[PDB]
Amino acid sequence: GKVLSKIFGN
């Protein structure tokens, strides 16, 4: 959830 945000970001 933070990845998409942290990995993926945005």
Ligand SMILES: *C(=O)CCCCCCCCCCCCC
């Ligand atoms: C927040 O929603 C985290 C989800 C980010 C997507 C990860 C999907 C892939 C999961 C398998 C990778 C190995 C598991 C740690």
